[PDB]
Amino acid sequence: GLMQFTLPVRLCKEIELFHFDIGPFENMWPGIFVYMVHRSCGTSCFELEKLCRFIMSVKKNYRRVPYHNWKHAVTVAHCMYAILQNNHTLFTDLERKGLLIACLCHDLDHRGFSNSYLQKFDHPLAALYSTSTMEQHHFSQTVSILQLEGHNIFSTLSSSEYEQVLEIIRKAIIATDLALYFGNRKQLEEMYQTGSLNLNNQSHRDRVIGLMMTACDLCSVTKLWPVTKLTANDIYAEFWAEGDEMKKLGIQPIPMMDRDKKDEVPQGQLGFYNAVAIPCYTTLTQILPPTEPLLKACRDNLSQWEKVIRGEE
Ligand SMILES: O=c1ccn(-c2ccncc2)nc1-c1ccnn1-c1cccc(Br)c1
Ligand SMILES: [Mg+2]
Ligand SMILES: [Zn+2]
């Protein structure tokens, strides 16, 4: 109980900031996650031995893919940490427990392929889970690891609290299906603008947590430009591989996934910022004002992609 995790001074300070990059030292990422759980949730939330065993089994079940890997899991959990720490009083004890774990586990066993590719390939998972295919798999993997001997980090919760936290985790992971984001944000936009948004309404809380999950999931676009630009390489490395696999199925992939069309990436990034990222952080900042730095950073990166198009870099 008296064993605190402590980071070097630069990490101790910068980990509080939304634009923090967890760095290239993979062996520091478990410690970074435990540090965040301890400060976000408490030193009492989890048995350290169980938490450490859970974290290391989660790591093992992320694959060696360019983007949807262990570093993405910890990066998304850090963005959730920053949101929770900047909104101290808004979230319940169970939400703080659930949401860092949901973020760490949200892409478990990702292969670097979209729901669309799994459906066109006729992958077994597409028959098991007709919608939100990979997201239902990610939740299934989370439950599998939680049920390994000595991995049940929630063991001190009551039957009803345990059911509640696993329901928070399921909804949070399903919400990372970007197909579901468009309608979720539109409903949240209407609720905020007509003033009907009510954080005591459980169905409203679910929507706000969904948008937080999208915001954390896309948080690569809220980093300093050099991080955002280099992460884009990893994102498109996966898109281009999926494009190659579409071509192997005898299907011309969309331009975004076609490596023959790299010239179109800058304009594609603009579309993504304007259609997905900026609207996401705008609605999140309206509902949770202290998350405004994510929107500011997103807008800075939009401006950088406009400079790339104008040949200014
Ligand atoms: O730069 C991007 C360009 C396009 N798309 C995208 C376009 C349509 N459908 C899905 C993704 N996402 C990104 C992006 C930026 C940050 N994260 N992601 C991301 C990547 C894969 C998957 C999920 Br979820 C998110
Ligand atoms: Mg995902
Ligand atoms: Zn993700």
mmCIF file of C-alpha atoms and ligand atoms in Angstrom:
data_model
loop_
_atom_site.group_PDB
_atom_site.id
_atom_site.type_symbol
_atom_site.label_atom_id
_atom_site.label_comp_id
_atom_site.label_asym_id
_atom_site.label_seq_id
_atom_site.Cartn_x
_atom_site.Cartn_y
_atom_site.Cartn_z
ATOM 1 C CA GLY A 1 0.000 0.000 0.000
ATOM 2 C CA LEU A 2 2.873 2.441 0.909
ATOM 3 C CA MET A 3 4.700 1.615 -2.437
ATOM 4 C CA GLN A 4 4.114 4.653 -4.753
ATOM 5 C CA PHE A 5 5.209 4.626 -8.427
ATOM 6 C CA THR A 6 7.322 7.768 -9.157
ATOM 7 C CA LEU A 7 8.456 8.982 -12.612
ATOM 8 C CA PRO A 8 11.536 11.069 -13.487
ATOM 9 C CA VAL A 9 10.807 14.840 -13.120
ATOM 10 C CA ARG A 10 10.157 15.580 -16.863
ATOM 11 C CA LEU A 11 7.641 12.621 -17.053
ATOM 12 C CA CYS A 12 6.086 13.413 -13.610
ATOM 13 C CA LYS A 13 5.248 16.961 -14.946
ATOM 14 C CA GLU A 14 4.439 16.301 -18.654
ATOM 15 C CA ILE A 15 2.245 13.161 -17.944
ATOM 16 C CA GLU A 16 -0.391 15.617 -16.516
ATOM 17 C CA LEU A 17 -0.614 17.365 -19.943
ATOM 18 C CA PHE A 18 -2.953 16.144 -22.728
ATOM 19 C CA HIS A 19 -0.154 16.193 -25.416
ATOM 20 C CA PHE A 20 2.185 13.819 -23.430
ATOM 21 C CA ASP A 21 3.989 11.177 -25.581
ATOM 22 C CA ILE A 22 4.749 7.970 -23.542
ATOM 23 C CA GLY A 23 8.199 7.651 -25.270
ATOM 24 C CA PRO A 24 10.039 4.754 -26.987
ATOM 25 C CA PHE A 25 11.036 2.804 -23.790
ATOM 26 C CA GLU A 26 8.377 -0.005 -23.841
ATOM 27 C CA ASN A 27 9.561 -1.255 -20.378
ATOM 28 C CA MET A 28 8.419 2.109 -18.804
ATOM 29 C CA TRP A 29 4.772 1.855 -20.122
ATOM 30 C CA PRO A 30 3.409 -0.584 -17.445
ATOM 31 C CA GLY A 31 4.845 1.709 -14.710
ATOM 32 C CA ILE A 32 3.330 4.774 -16.490
ATOM 33 C CA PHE A 33 -0.123 3.027 -16.483
ATOM 34 C CA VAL A 34 0.089 2.028 -12.752
ATOM 35 C CA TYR A 35 1.206 5.620 -11.890
ATOM 36 C CA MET A 36 -1.935 6.906 -13.714
ATOM 37 C CA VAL A 37 -4.301 4.363 -11.994
ATOM 38 C CA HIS A 38 -2.826 5.310 -8.543
ATOM 39 C CA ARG A 39 -3.313 9.109 -9.145
ATOM 40 C CA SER A 40 -6.657 8.789 -11.103
ATOM 41 C CA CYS A 41 -8.335 6.060 -8.995
ATOM 42 C CA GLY A 42 -6.231 5.578 -5.801
ATOM 43 C CA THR A 43 -3.464 3.266 -4.457
ATOM 44 C CA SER A 44 -6.337 1.128 -2.941
ATOM 45 C CA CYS A 45 -8.374 0.633 -6.217
ATOM 46 C CA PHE A 46 -6.405 -2.499 -7.273
ATOM 47 C CA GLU A 47 -4.152 -5.126 -5.614
ATOM 48 C CA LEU A 48 -0.731 -4.178 -7.122
ATOM 49 C CA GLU A 49 0.230 -7.875 -7.758
ATOM 50 C CA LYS A 50 -3.103 -8.577 -9.610
ATOM 51 C CA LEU A 51 -2.941 -5.238 -11.559
ATOM 52 C CA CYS A 52 0.682 -5.990 -12.720
ATOM 53 C CA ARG A 53 -0.309 -9.555 -13.811
ATOM 54 C CA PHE A 54 -3.412 -8.118 -15.626
ATOM 55 C CA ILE A 55 -1.300 -5.379 -17.418
ATOM 56 C CA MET A 56 1.354 -7.926 -18.570
ATOM 57 C CA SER A 57 -1.348 -10.337 -19.955
ATOM 58 C CA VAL A 58 -3.039 -7.355 -21.751
ATOM 59 C CA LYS A 59 0.379 -6.425 -23.288
ATOM 60 C CA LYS A 60 0.921 -10.057 -24.481
ATOM 61 C CA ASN A 61 -2.518 -10.033 -26.251
ATOM 62 C CA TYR A 62 -1.663 -6.915 -28.353
ATOM 63 C CA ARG A 63 0.015 -7.897 -31.670
ATOM 64 C CA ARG A 64 3.202 -6.577 -33.357
ATOM 65 C CA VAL A 65 1.256 -4.402 -35.869
ATOM 66 C CA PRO A 66 2.393 -0.891 -36.932
ATOM 67 C CA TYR A 67 -0.321 1.170 -35.117
ATOM 68 C CA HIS A 68 -2.994 -0.959 -33.266
ATOM 69 C CA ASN A 69 -0.356 -2.155 -30.733
ATOM 70 C CA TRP A 70 0.515 -1.968 -26.993
ATOM 71 C CA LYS A 71 1.827 1.663 -27.402
ATOM 72 C CA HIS A 72 -1.633 2.712 -28.767
ATOM 73 C CA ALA A 73 -3.380 1.029 -25.754
ATOM 74 C CA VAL A 74 -1.206 2.962 -23.226
ATOM 75 C CA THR A 75 -1.475 6.235 -25.274
ATOM 76 C CA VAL A 76 -5.329 6.030 -25.255
ATOM 77 C CA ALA A 77 -5.302 5.247 -21.472
ATOM 78 C CA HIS A 78 -3.083 8.353 -20.902
ATOM 79 C CA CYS A 79 -5.589 10.645 -22.747
ATOM 80 C CA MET A 80 -8.403 9.190 -20.517
ATOM 81 C CA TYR A 81 -6.145 9.850 -17.449
ATOM 82 C CA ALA A 82 -5.745 13.549 -18.495
ATOM 83 C CA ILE A 83 -9.565 13.913 -19.007
ATOM 84 C CA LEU A 84 -10.343 12.278 -15.598
ATOM 85 C CA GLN A 85 -7.677 14.378 -13.749
ATOM 86 C CA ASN A 86 -9.000 17.657 -15.341
ATOM 87 C CA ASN A 87 -12.656 16.675 -14.397
ATOM 88 C CA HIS A 88 -11.982 15.423 -10.793
ATOM 89 C CA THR A 89 -15.561 15.634 -9.389
ATOM 90 C CA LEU A 90 -17.671 14.607 -12.497
ATOM 91 C CA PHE A 91 -16.937 10.812 -12.488
ATOM 92 C CA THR A 92 -17.936 8.045 -10.025
ATOM 93 C CA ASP A 93 -15.487 5.679 -8.217
ATOM 94 C CA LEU A 94 -16.515 2.784 -10.579
ATOM 95 C CA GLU A 95 -16.151 4.971 -13.738
ATOM 96 C CA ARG A 96 -12.489 5.859 -12.859
ATOM 97 C CA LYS A 97 -11.652 2.130 -12.238
ATOM 98 C CA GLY A 98 -13.497 0.998 -15.417
ATOM 99 C CA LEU A 99 -12.410 3.658 -17.947
ATOM 100 C CA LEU A 100 -8.574 3.372 -17.653
ATOM 101 C CA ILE A 101 -8.936 -0.443 -17.975
ATOM 102 C CA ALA A 102 -11.426 -0.039 -20.899
ATOM 103 C CA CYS A 103 -8.863 2.196 -22.734
ATOM 104 C CA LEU A 104 -5.933 -0.198 -22.063
ATOM 105 C CA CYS A 105 -8.050 -3.154 -23.388
ATOM 106 C CA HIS A 106 -10.053 -1.322 -26.137
ATOM 107 C CA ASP A 107 -8.040 -2.790 -29.136
ATOM 108 C CA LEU A 108 -6.995 -6.195 -27.579
ATOM 109 C CA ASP A 109 -5.834 -8.706 -30.260
ATOM 110 C CA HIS A 110 -6.214 -6.157 -33.133
ATOM 111 C CA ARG A 111 -4.798 -7.512 -36.467
ATOM 112 C CA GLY A 112 -4.555 -4.029 -38.130
ATOM 113 C CA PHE A 113 -7.704 -4.655 -40.271
ATOM 114 C CA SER A 114 -11.084 -2.829 -40.225
ATOM 115 C CA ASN A 115 -14.528 -4.382 -39.576
ATOM 116 C CA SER A 116 -15.137 -3.875 -43.377
ATOM 117 C CA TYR A 117 -12.109 -6.062 -44.347
ATOM 118 C CA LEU A 118 -13.158 -8.878 -41.899
ATOM 119 C CA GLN A 119 -16.698 -8.826 -43.510
ATOM 120 C CA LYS A 120 -15.312 -8.927 -47.115
ATOM 121 C CA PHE A 121 -12.763 -11.674 -46.176
ATOM 122 C CA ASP A 122 -15.676 -13.601 -44.514
ATOM 123 C CA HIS A 123 -13.610 -13.909 -41.258
ATOM 124 C CA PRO A 124 -15.183 -16.130 -38.521
ATOM 125 C CA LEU A 125 -15.451 -13.056 -36.171
ATOM 126 C CA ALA A 126 -17.768 -11.385 -38.795
ATOM 127 C CA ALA A 127 -20.225 -14.374 -38.407
ATOM 128 C CA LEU A 128 -19.923 -14.304 -34.550
ATOM 129 C CA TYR A 129 -20.375 -10.449 -34.331
ATOM 130 C CA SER A 130 -22.373 -8.962 -37.266
ATOM 131 C CA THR A 131 -21.781 -5.286 -36.145
ATOM 132 C CA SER A 132 -18.897 -3.629 -34.202
ATOM 133 C CA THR A 133 -17.040 -6.893 -35.097
ATOM 134 C CA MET A 134 -13.525 -6.123 -33.718
ATOM 135 C CA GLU A 135 -14.958 -4.114 -30.753
ATOM 136 C CA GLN A 136 -17.105 -7.106 -29.560
ATOM 137 C CA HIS A 137 -13.885 -9.231 -29.898
ATOM 138 C CA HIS A 138 -11.856 -6.636 -27.856
ATOM 139 C CA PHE A 139 -14.464 -6.827 -25.016
ATOM 140 C CA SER A 140 -14.527 -10.697 -25.205
ATOM 141 C CA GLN A 141 -10.662 -10.696 -24.864
ATOM 142 C CA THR A 142 -10.908 -8.282 -21.857
ATOM 143 C CA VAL A 143 -13.356 -10.698 -20.081
ATOM 144 C CA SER A 144 -11.089 -13.723 -20.987
ATOM 145 C CA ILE A 145 -8.022 -12.051 -19.316
ATOM 146 C CA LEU A 146 -10.104 -10.864 -16.259
ATOM 147 C CA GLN A 147 -11.072 -14.582 -15.747
ATOM 148 C CA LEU A 148 -7.442 -15.922 -15.792
ATOM 149 C CA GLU A 149 -6.357 -17.114 -12.284
ATOM 150 C CA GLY A 150 -4.985 -14.155 -10.235
ATOM 151 C CA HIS A 151 -6.024 -11.584 -12.951
ATOM 152 C CA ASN A 152 -9.358 -10.459 -11.397
ATOM 153 C CA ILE A 153 -8.476 -6.838 -10.441
ATOM 154 C CA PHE A 154 -12.191 -6.237 -9.537
ATOM 155 C CA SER A 155 -12.376 -9.174 -7.015
ATOM 156 C CA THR A 156 -13.099 -6.765 -4.036
ATOM 157 C CA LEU A 157 -16.223 -5.321 -5.846
ATOM 158 C CA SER A 158 -19.739 -6.594 -4.922
ATOM 159 C CA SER A 159 -21.618 -8.742 -7.508
ATOM 160 C CA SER A 160 -23.650 -5.607 -8.568
ATOM 161 C CA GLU A 161 -20.600 -3.230 -8.658
ATOM 162 C CA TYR A 162 -18.676 -5.899 -10.687
ATOM 163 C CA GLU A 163 -21.621 -6.129 -13.185
ATOM 164 C CA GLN A 164 -21.716 -2.271 -13.364
ATOM 165 C CA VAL A 165 -17.930 -1.885 -14.052
ATOM 166 C CA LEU A 166 -17.999 -4.632 -16.782
ATOM 167 C CA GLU A 167 -21.034 -2.810 -18.307
ATOM 168 C CA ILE A 168 -19.049 0.526 -18.221
ATOM 169 C CA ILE A 169 -16.110 -1.334 -19.920
ATOM 170 C CA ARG A 170 -18.358 -3.040 -22.566
ATOM 171 C CA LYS A 171 -20.113 0.245 -23.589
ATOM 172 C CA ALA A 172 -16.751 2.175 -23.571
ATOM 173 C CA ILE A 173 -15.069 -0.446 -25.854
ATOM 174 C CA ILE A 174 -18.138 -0.739 -28.214
ATOM 175 C CA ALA A 175 -18.170 3.115 -28.468
ATOM 176 C CA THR A 176 -14.628 2.949 -30.065
ATOM 177 C CA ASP A 177 -16.398 1.613 -33.204
ATOM 178 C CA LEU A 178 -16.055 4.903 -35.187
ATOM 179 C CA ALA A 179 -19.214 3.896 -37.233
ATOM 180 C CA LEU A 180 -21.173 4.540 -33.947
ATOM 181 C CA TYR A 181 -19.398 7.904 -33.218
ATOM 182 C CA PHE A 182 -21.247 10.021 -35.892
ATOM 183 C CA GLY A 183 -24.746 9.393 -34.422
ATOM 184 C CA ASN A 184 -23.485 9.561 -30.799
ATOM 185 C CA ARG A 185 -21.899 13.039 -31.339
ATOM 186 C CA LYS A 186 -25.015 14.341 -33.273
ATOM 187 C CA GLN A 187 -27.300 13.266 -30.345
ATOM 188 C CA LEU A 188 -24.874 14.879 -27.808
ATOM 189 C CA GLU A 189 -24.724 18.089 -29.958
ATOM 190 C CA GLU A 190 -28.606 18.301 -29.960
ATOM 191 C CA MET A 191 -28.804 17.550 -26.170
ATOM 192 C CA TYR A 192 -26.194 20.279 -25.318
ATOM 193 C CA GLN A 193 -27.761 22.898 -27.715
ATOM 194 C CA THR A 194 -31.407 22.313 -26.495
ATOM 195 C CA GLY A 195 -30.052 22.164 -22.880
ATOM 196 C CA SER A 196 -31.608 18.671 -22.257
ATOM 197 C CA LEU A 197 -28.123 17.124 -21.452
ATOM 198 C CA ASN A 198 -28.343 15.682 -17.883
ATOM 199 C CA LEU A 199 -25.315 13.857 -16.325
ATOM 200 C CA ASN A 200 -27.695 12.188 -13.745
ATOM 201 C CA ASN A 201 -29.424 10.434 -16.728
ATOM 202 C CA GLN A 202 -27.467 7.118 -17.087
ATOM 203 C CA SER A 203 -28.220 6.974 -20.903
ATOM 204 C CA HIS A 204 -26.710 10.538 -21.179
ATOM 205 C CA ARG A 205 -23.589 9.548 -19.123
ATOM 206 C CA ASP A 206 -23.135 6.514 -21.466
ATOM 207 C CA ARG A 207 -23.166 8.931 -24.485
ATOM 208 C CA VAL A 208 -20.608 11.335 -22.842
ATOM 209 C CA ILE A 209 -18.312 8.344 -21.930
ATOM 210 C CA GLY A 210 -18.687 7.133 -25.570
ATOM 211 C CA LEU A 211 -17.448 10.535 -26.864
ATOM 212 C CA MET A 212 -14.556 10.503 -24.290
ATOM 213 C CA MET A 213 -13.610 7.029 -25.704
ATOM 214 C CA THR A 214 -13.602 8.428 -29.316
ATOM 215 C CA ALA A 215 -11.549 11.494 -28.121
ATOM 216 C CA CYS A 216 -8.967 9.255 -26.316
ATOM 217 C CA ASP A 217 -8.883 6.796 -29.290
ATOM 218 C CA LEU A 218 -8.136 9.605 -31.845
ATOM 219 C CA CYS A 219 -5.695 11.441 -29.456
ATOM 220 C CA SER A 220 -2.730 10.970 -31.945
ATOM 221 C CA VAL A 221 -4.200 14.058 -33.747
ATOM 222 C CA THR A 222 -3.877 16.118 -30.447
ATOM 223 C CA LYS A 223 -0.084 15.593 -29.945
ATOM 224 C CA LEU A 224 2.699 18.030 -30.955
ATOM 225 C CA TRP A 225 3.058 18.024 -34.797
ATOM 226 C CA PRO A 226 6.213 15.777 -34.936
ATOM 227 C CA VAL A 227 4.368 13.021 -32.887
ATOM 228 C CA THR A 228 1.139 13.398 -34.975
ATOM 229 C CA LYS A 229 3.095 13.339 -38.302
ATOM 230 C CA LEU A 230 5.174 10.210 -37.356
ATOM 231 C CA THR A 231 2.089 8.395 -35.900
ATOM 232 C CA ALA A 232 0.299 9.076 -39.278
ATOM 233 C CA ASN A 233 3.019 6.866 -40.949
ATOM 234 C CA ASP A 234 2.051 3.931 -38.631
ATOM 235 C CA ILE A 235 -1.721 4.519 -39.210
ATOM 236 C CA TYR A 236 -1.310 4.534 -43.049
ATOM 237 C CA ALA A 237 1.149 1.553 -42.941
ATOM 238 C CA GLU A 238 -1.874 -0.456 -41.647
ATOM 239 C CA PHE A 239 -4.341 1.195 -44.132
ATOM 240 C CA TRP A 240 -2.028 0.322 -47.093
ATOM 241 C CA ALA A 241 -1.622 -3.341 -45.913
ATOM 242 C CA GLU A 242 -5.462 -3.618 -45.727
ATOM 243 C CA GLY A 243 -5.598 -2.079 -49.240
ATOM 244 C CA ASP A 244 -3.131 -4.764 -50.432
ATOM 245 C CA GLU A 245 -5.398 -7.476 -48.858
ATOM 246 C CA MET A 246 -8.502 -5.883 -50.524
ATOM 247 C CA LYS A 247 -6.633 -6.102 -53.917
ATOM 248 C CA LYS A 248 -5.877 -9.821 -53.130
ATOM 249 C CA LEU A 249 -9.700 -10.365 -52.691
ATOM 250 C CA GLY A 250 -10.195 -8.728 -56.172
ATOM 251 C CA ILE A 251 -11.618 -5.464 -54.660
ATOM 252 C CA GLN A 252 -10.190 -1.982 -55.463
ATOM 253 C CA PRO A 253 -9.787 -0.449 -51.971
ATOM 254 C CA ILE A 254 -10.884 3.161 -51.183
ATOM 255 C CA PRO A 255 -8.048 5.657 -51.983
ATOM 256 C CA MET A 256 -7.216 6.043 -48.208
ATOM 257 C CA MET A 257 -6.041 2.338 -48.177
ATOM 258 C CA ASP A 258 -4.324 2.427 -51.665
ATOM 259 C CA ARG A 259 -0.499 2.810 -51.380
ATOM 260 C CA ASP A 260 -0.468 3.823 -55.113
ATOM 261 C CA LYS A 261 -2.338 7.020 -53.946
ATOM 262 C CA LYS A 262 -0.006 8.373 -51.135
ATOM 263 C CA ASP A 263 -0.215 11.819 -52.898
ATOM 264 C CA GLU A 264 -3.887 12.021 -51.616
ATOM 265 C CA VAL A 265 -2.977 11.558 -47.858
ATOM 266 C CA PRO A 266 -2.697 15.311 -46.976
ATOM 267 C CA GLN A 267 -6.252 16.086 -48.330
ATOM 268 C CA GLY A 268 -7.514 12.813 -46.692
ATOM 269 C CA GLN A 269 -6.135 14.027 -43.299
ATOM 270 C CA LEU A 270 -7.991 17.397 -43.799
ATOM 271 C CA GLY A 271 -11.255 15.446 -44.424
ATOM 272 C CA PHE A 272 -10.680 13.330 -41.290
ATOM 273 C CA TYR A 273 -9.931 16.399 -39.085
ATOM 274 C CA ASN A 274 -12.982 18.329 -40.459
ATOM 275 C CA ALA A 275 -15.446 15.322 -40.509
ATOM 276 C CA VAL A 276 -14.302 13.364 -37.374
ATOM 277 C CA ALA A 277 -11.586 14.839 -35.104
ATOM 278 C CA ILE A 278 -12.503 18.599 -34.822
ATOM 279 C CA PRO A 279 -16.269 17.911 -34.319
ATOM 280 C CA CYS A 280 -15.345 15.233 -31.664
ATOM 281 C CA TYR A 281 -13.088 17.572 -29.577
ATOM 282 C CA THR A 282 -15.528 20.548 -30.144
ATOM 283 C CA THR A 283 -18.518 18.627 -28.600
ATOM 284 C CA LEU A 284 -16.238 17.189 -25.846
ATOM 285 C CA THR A 285 -15.052 20.772 -24.951
ATOM 286 C CA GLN A 286 -18.728 21.983 -24.806
ATOM 287 C CA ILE A 287 -19.648 19.116 -22.379
ATOM 288 C CA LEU A 288 -16.272 19.121 -20.474
ATOM 289 C CA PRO A 289 -14.666 22.604 -20.742
ATOM 290 C CA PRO A 290 -11.288 21.550 -19.170
ATOM 291 C CA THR A 291 -10.640 19.244 -22.256
ATOM 292 C CA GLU A 292 -10.255 22.390 -24.482
ATOM 293 C CA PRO A 293 -6.462 21.730 -24.874
ATOM 294 C CA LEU A 294 -7.318 18.600 -27.012
ATOM 295 C CA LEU A 295 -9.394 20.840 -29.397
ATOM 296 C CA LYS A 296 -6.627 23.540 -29.532
ATOM 297 C CA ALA A 297 -3.965 20.846 -30.333
ATOM 298 C CA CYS A 298 -6.238 19.219 -32.964
ATOM 299 C CA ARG A 299 -6.714 22.650 -34.651
ATOM 300 C CA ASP A 300 -2.894 23.275 -34.571
ATOM 301 C CA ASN A 301 -2.390 19.901 -36.401
ATOM 302 C CA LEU A 302 -5.175 20.751 -38.938
ATOM 303 C CA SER A 303 -3.181 23.967 -39.690
ATOM 304 C CA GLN A 304 0.044 21.862 -40.147
ATOM 305 C CA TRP A 305 -1.709 19.540 -42.736
ATOM 306 C CA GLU A 306 -2.920 22.685 -44.621
ATOM 307 C CA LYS A 307 0.783 23.815 -44.698
ATOM 308 C CA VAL A 308 1.758 20.343 -46.120
ATOM 309 C CA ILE A 309 -0.809 20.840 -48.997
ATOM 310 C CA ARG A 310 0.444 24.424 -49.739
ATOM 311 C CA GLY A 311 3.982 22.867 -50.071
ATOM 312 C CA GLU A 312 5.182 24.943 -47.022
ATOM 313 C CA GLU A 313 6.302 21.531 -45.553
HETATM 314 O O1 LIG B 1 -5.740 9.637 -39.524
HETATM 315 C C1 LIG B 1 -6.735 8.962 -39.756
HETATM 316 C C2 LIG B 1 -7.290 8.886 -41.070
HETATM 317 C C3 LIG B 1 -8.410 8.118 -41.243
HETATM 318 N N1 LIG B 1 -8.969 7.448 -40.189
HETATM 319 C C4 LIG B 1 -10.134 6.676 -40.373
HETATM 320 C C5 LIG B 1 -11.009 6.956 -41.426
HETATM 321 C C6 LIG B 1 -12.159 6.210 -41.571
HETATM 322 N N2 LIG B 1 -12.440 5.225 -40.730
HETATM 323 C C7 LIG B 1 -11.629 4.920 -39.716
HETATM 324 C C8 LIG B 1 -10.464 5.630 -39.491
HETATM 325 N N3 LIG B 1 -8.500 7.508 -38.989
HETATM 326 C C9 LIG B 1 -7.421 8.195 -38.696
HETATM 327 C C10 LIG B 1 -6.985 8.206 -37.289
HETATM 328 C C11 LIG B 1 -6.366 9.248 -36.650
HETATM 329 C C12 LIG B 1 -6.158 8.867 -35.325
HETATM 330 N N4 LIG B 1 -6.629 7.651 -35.163
HETATM 331 N N5 LIG B 1 -7.161 7.208 -36.373
HETATM 332 C C13 LIG B 1 -7.731 5.929 -36.543
HETATM 333 C C14 LIG B 1 -7.178 5.002 -37.422
HETATM 334 C C15 LIG B 1 -7.762 3.735 -37.528
HETATM 335 C C16 LIG B 1 -8.870 3.386 -36.766
HETATM 336 C C17 LIG B 1 -9.401 4.304 -35.877
HETATM 337 BR BR1 LIG B 1 -10.905 3.894 -34.756
HETATM 338 C C18 LIG B 1 -8.826 5.563 -35.777
HETATM 339 MG MG MG B 2 -10.515 -0.146 -32.254
HETATM 340 ZN ZN ZN B 3 -7.889 2.301 -30.773
#
